[PDB]
Structure 1
Amino acid sequence: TKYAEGTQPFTVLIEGNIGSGKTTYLNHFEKYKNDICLLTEPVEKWRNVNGVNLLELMYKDPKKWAMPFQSYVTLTMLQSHTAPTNKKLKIMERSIFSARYCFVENMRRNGSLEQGMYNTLEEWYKFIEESIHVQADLIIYLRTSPEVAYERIRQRARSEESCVPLKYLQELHELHEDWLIHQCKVLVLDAD
């Protein structure tokens, strides 16, 4: 009896690299609140963890905060994935899968997450996928280019994620590809 069983409608997962136009995209539903369950990335919760900004800390010193920060992202992704709703359609920005398969994995490859820290996160993920139901019917992949994405970031009045190397976006891009492209229903869209 996985927490949040028969209480989740058709769920759409909006995926994409950093600066792939996920925010602008989901805004089209901003006027469908009255009919659909629209859940944007819990970025605000990550900026206000009872006073601490884990998002800002992780970028200013990964090797020290990637672990706690990623552990919190997971929890917020879980709360959304299992949150109760009356609507018959749920649209989520990002998900527990991308945080795991892309962001955590990336941080392991580039050294931000040491062995013990990564393992701890993986153990939590394994338990979750065995004792919790994650409704993921459709996946909307906003495929982009590391370069294009890098530009869209530099353009906006960014804050925390503004100082990210192009290489970071390249490694992230590849992970999304390996997961959403090179092996459920995934609808790729040319987000350019």
Structure 2
Amino acid sequence: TQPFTVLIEGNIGSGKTTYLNHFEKYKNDICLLTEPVEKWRNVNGVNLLELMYKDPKKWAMPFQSYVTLTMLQSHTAPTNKKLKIMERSIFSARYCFVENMRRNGSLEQGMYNTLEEWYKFIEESIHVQADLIIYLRTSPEVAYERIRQRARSEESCVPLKYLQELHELHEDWLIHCKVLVLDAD
């Protein structure tokens, strides 16, 4: 029992937070689920996001596992509203962020495989509500400027190359469920 669901997808620095704020005035009639970064930063006093960025070969696995969980919690969360808008999803976690961490060697085969088994079990047990994806398409260099533009201790070591990798993965998934592409440049 889930309302019409829109997912906001795009690279780091694609303006999703700014875009999602346009909907804040409609909170009375729309279910607005911000990406649970605050959950990730305080898993009982542990900042998994910081640990992942600081040491990905060690922390990519637990971090992405906790991402999967929190996204699943958002996807299945109860609301009486007839429209739901989600910042990101279990799908970008899987198809972009986990895939990239596998490709750059931060997730070893067995760790990726464990994450993959969870996704399979989720998809087999739960139909995940996804009616529309709004893809905030950017160029990696503009995304880079947006990250530096905002003070975020965690992401302040992310190379342009990493953003390029995440860009191509969003392109594969979303270009190469209805997808609406917006020029977020």
TM-score, with structure 1 as normaliser: 0.95
Q: Which runs of 4+ in 1 moved over 3 A?
A: none
Of residues 162, 166, 184, the one that matches 1:172 is 166
Measured against aligned partners, the alpha-carbon deviations of 1:60-117 in whole angstroms (never above 9, x if no partner) come to: 0000000000000000000000011100000000000000000000000000000100
Aligned residue in 1 for 2:93: 99
- 1:82·1:133 contact (CA, 8 Å) conserved in 2? no
Aligned residue in 1 for 2:180: 187
Give the RMSD, CA atoms, in angstroms: 0.5
Secondary structure, aligned partner of 1:14? strand
- 1:17·1:176 contact (CA, 8 Å) conserved in 2? yes
Question: For residues 159 and 24 of structure 1, what CA distance do their matches in structure 2 show?
Answer: 19
Which runs of no fewer than 5 residues in structure 1 stay unpaired?
1-6
Measured against aligned partners, the alpha-carbon deviations of 1:18-52 in whole angstroms (never above 9, x if no partner) come to: 00000000001111111110000000000010110
- 1:46·1:54 contact (CA, 8 Å) conserved in 2? yes
Aligned residue in 2 for 1:37: 31
Question: For residues 114 and 134 of structure 2, what CA distance do their matches in structure 1 show?
Answer: 29
Question: For residues 46 and 160 of structure 2, what CA distance do their matches in structure 1 show?
Answer: 27
Question: For residues 8 and 32 of structure 1, what CA distance do their matches in structure 2 show?
Answer: 18
Secondary structure, aligned partner of 1:128? helix
- 1:146·1:170 contact (CA, 8 Å) conserved in 2? yes
Which moved further from structure 2: 50-59 or 154-163? 154-163
- 1:143·1:189 contact (CA, 8 Å) conserved in 2? yes
Measured against aligned partners, the alpha-carbon deviations of 1:134-160 in whole angstroms (never above 9, x if no partner) come to: 100000000000100011111111220
**Equivalent pairs, count:** 185
- 1:12·1:138 contact (CA, 8 Å) conserved in 2? yes
Question: For residues 125 and 108 of structure 1, what CA distance do their matches in structure 2 show?
Answer: 15
TM-score, with structure 2 as normaliser: 0.99
Question: For residues 43 and 148 of structure 2, what CA distance do their matches in structure 1 show?
Answer: 26
Q: Percent identity among equivalent residues?
A: 100
Offset of residue 162 of structure 1: 1.7
Question: For residues 157 and 113 of structure 1, what CA distance do their matches in structure 2 show?
Answer: 27
Question: For residues 8 and 161 of structure 1, what CA distance do their matches in structure 2 show?
Answer: 33
Of residues 82, 87, 97, the one that matches 2:81 is 87
